Design a protein around this motif. Structure first.
Motif, PDB file in Angstrom:
ATOM      1  N   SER A   1       8.317   6.119  -1.184  1.00 51.28           N
ATOM      2  CA  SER A   1       7.011   6.628  -1.587  1.00 51.28           C
ATOM      3  C   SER A   1       6.162   5.535  -2.223  1.00 51.28           C
ATOM      4  O   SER A   1       4.957   5.444  -1.960  1.00 51.28           O
ATOM      5  CB  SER A   1       7.182   7.798  -2.551  1.00 51.28           C
ATOM      6  N   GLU A   2       6.765   4.701  -3.071  1.00 54.14           N
ATOM      7  CA  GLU A   2       6.027   3.576  -3.634  1.00 54.14           C
ATOM      8  C   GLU A   2       5.640   2.581  -2.548  1.00 54.14           C
ATOM      9  O   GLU A   2       4.544   2.006  -2.583  1.00 54.14           O
ATOM     10  CB  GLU A   2       6.860   2.898  -4.719  1.00 54.14           C
ATOM     11  N   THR A   3       6.524   2.371  -1.571  1.00 56.88           N
ATOM     12  CA  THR A   3       6.176   1.533  -0.429  1.00 56.88           C
ATOM     13  C   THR A   3       4.957   2.081   0.300  1.00 56.88           C
ATOM     14  O   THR A   3       4.059   1.324   0.682  1.00 56.88           O
ATOM     15  CB  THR A   3       7.367   1.434   0.523  1.00 56.88           C
ATOM     16  N   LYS A   4       4.917   3.397   0.511  1.00 56.93           N
ATOM     17  CA  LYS A   4       3.755   4.015   1.143  1.00 56.93           C
ATOM     18  C   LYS A   4       2.503   3.800   0.304  1.00 56.93           C
ATOM     19  O   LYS A   4       1.453   3.401   0.822  1.00 56.93           O
ATOM     20  CB  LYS A   4       4.008   5.507   1.355  1.00 56.93           C
ATOM     21  N   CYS A   5       2.595   4.063  -1.001  1.00 60.50           N
ATOM     22  CA  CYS A   5       1.429   3.913  -1.864  1.00 60.50           C
ATOM     23  C   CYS A   5       0.923   2.479  -1.870  1.00 60.50           C
ATOM     24  O   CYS A   5      -0.276   2.245  -2.056  1.00 60.50           O
ATOM     25  CB  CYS A   5       1.763   4.364  -3.286  1.00 60.50           C
ATOM     26  N   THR A   6       1.815   1.508  -1.672  1.00 60.93           N
ATOM     27  CA  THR A   6       1.377   0.119  -1.578  1.00 60.93           C
ATOM     28  C   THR A   6       0.774  -0.179  -0.209  1.00 60.93           C
ATOM     29  O   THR A   6      -0.186  -0.950  -0.106  1.00 60.93           O
ATOM     30  CB  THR A   6       2.544  -0.824  -1.863  1.00 60.93           C
TER      31      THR A   6
ATOM     32  N   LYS B   1      -0.552   2.263   1.697  1.00 59.69           N
ATOM     33  CA  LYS B   1      -1.600   3.255   1.931  1.00 59.69           C
ATOM     34  C   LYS B   1      -1.465   3.857   3.327  1.00 59.69           C
ATOM     35  O   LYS B   1      -2.426   3.937   4.095  1.00 59.69           O
ATOM     36  CB  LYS B   1      -2.990   2.648   1.727  1.00 59.69           C
ATOM     37  N   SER B   2      -0.249   4.287   3.653  1.00 59.30           N
ATOM     38  CA  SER B   2       0.036   4.880   4.949  1.00 59.30           C
ATOM     39  C   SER B   2       1.239   5.802   4.823  1.00 59.30           C
ATOM     40  O   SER B   2       2.056   5.661   3.910  1.00 59.30           O
ATOM     41  CB  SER B   2       0.302   3.810   6.012  1.00 59.30           C
ATOM     42  N   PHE B   3       1.334   6.748   5.754  1.00 55.89           N
ATOM     43  CA  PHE B   3       2.426   7.708   5.791  1.00 55.89           C
ATOM     44  C   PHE B   3       3.478   7.372   6.837  1.00 55.89           C
ATOM     45  O   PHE B   3       4.440   8.131   6.989  1.00 55.89           O
ATOM     46  CB  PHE B   3       1.879   9.115   6.060  1.00 55.89           C
TER      47      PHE B   3
ATOM     48  N   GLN C   1       7.076  -3.995   2.526  1.00 53.53           N
ATOM     49  CA  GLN C   1       6.452  -4.088   1.214  1.00 53.53           C
ATOM     50  C   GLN C   1       7.421  -4.650   0.189  1.00 53.53           C
ATOM     51  O   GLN C   1       8.596  -4.272   0.159  1.00 53.53           O
ATOM     52  CB  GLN C   1       5.945  -2.720   0.747  1.00 53.53           C
TER      53      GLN C   1
ATOM     54  N   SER D   1       7.702  -3.837  -3.110  1.00 50.74           N
ATOM     55  CA  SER D   1       7.134  -2.686  -3.803  1.00 50.74           C
ATOM     56  C   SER D   1       6.499  -3.079  -5.133  1.00 50.74           C
ATOM     57  O   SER D   1       5.287  -2.938  -5.325  1.00 50.74           O
ATOM     58  CB  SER D   1       8.220  -1.630  -4.017  1.00 50.74           C
ATOM     59  N   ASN D   2       7.303  -3.574  -6.061  1.00 50.28           N
ATOM     60  CA  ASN D   2       6.833  -3.890  -7.406  1.00 50.28           C
ATOM     61  C   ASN D   2       7.923  -4.704  -8.094  1.00 50.28           C
ATOM     62  O   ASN D   2       8.894  -5.131  -7.458  1.00 50.28           O
ATOM     63  CB  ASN D   2       6.483  -2.616  -8.179  1.00 50.28           C
TER      64      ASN D   2
END
Lengths: 50, 107
Positions: free
Chosen positions: A5-10, A12-14, A22, A24-25
């Motif tokens: 989910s954090e990968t998606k938020c980075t 910006k895709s589903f 990514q 991630s952080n």
């Protein structure tokens, strides 16, 4: 909720493709305790001038 | 610290006597906050010394003042039969008037 989910938020895709898509952080270990270590002395000449 | 003075002092006519005072304070304005008032028996006091290296106008020259460290001194060049009265040193450094304990003068 999870690394994906954090990968998606980075991204910006589903729909994440294959790979390391990514970074991630970063993992910042939290500060668990607080410390205040000032000196020791007496009161001050507050109103010796006012 | 509160002001302190000797319990009393003695002398005789023509003799030069002196009175002390300890317990003064200070501030950014200087250290000359000492004033002496002479109160005769049963009547209003009168200012005698202010700014110990000075004194009010019209004051007789028979009196003189000086300071040294945390201690002050009130010098009198000559006593008189009518000089029997109380004397109080007072400090007004930190916007707070703290009169002295009082010391008696006799001959």
């Amino acid at each position: 909720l999870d690394p994906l989910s954090e990968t998606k938020c980075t991204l910006k895709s589903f729909t994440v493709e294959k790979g390391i898509y990514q970074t991630s952080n970063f993992r910042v270990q939290p500060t668990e305790s607080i410390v205040r270590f000032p000196n020791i002395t007496n009161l001050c000449p507050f109103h010796e001038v006012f | 610290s509160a002001l302190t003075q000797p319990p009393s002092a003695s002398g005789s006519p023509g003799q030069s006597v002196t009175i002390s005072c300890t317990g003064a304070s200070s501030d950014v304005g200087g250290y000359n906050y000492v004033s002496w008032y002479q109160q005769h028996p049963g009547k209003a006091p009168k200012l005698m010394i202010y700014e110990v290296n000075k004194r009010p106008s019209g004051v007789p020259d028979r009196f003189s003042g000086s300071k040294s460290g945390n201690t002050a001194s009130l010098t009198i060049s000559g006593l008189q039969a009518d000089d029997e009265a109380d004397y109080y040193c007072c400090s007004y450094a930190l916007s707070r008037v703290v009169f002295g304990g009082g010391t008696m003068l006799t001959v």
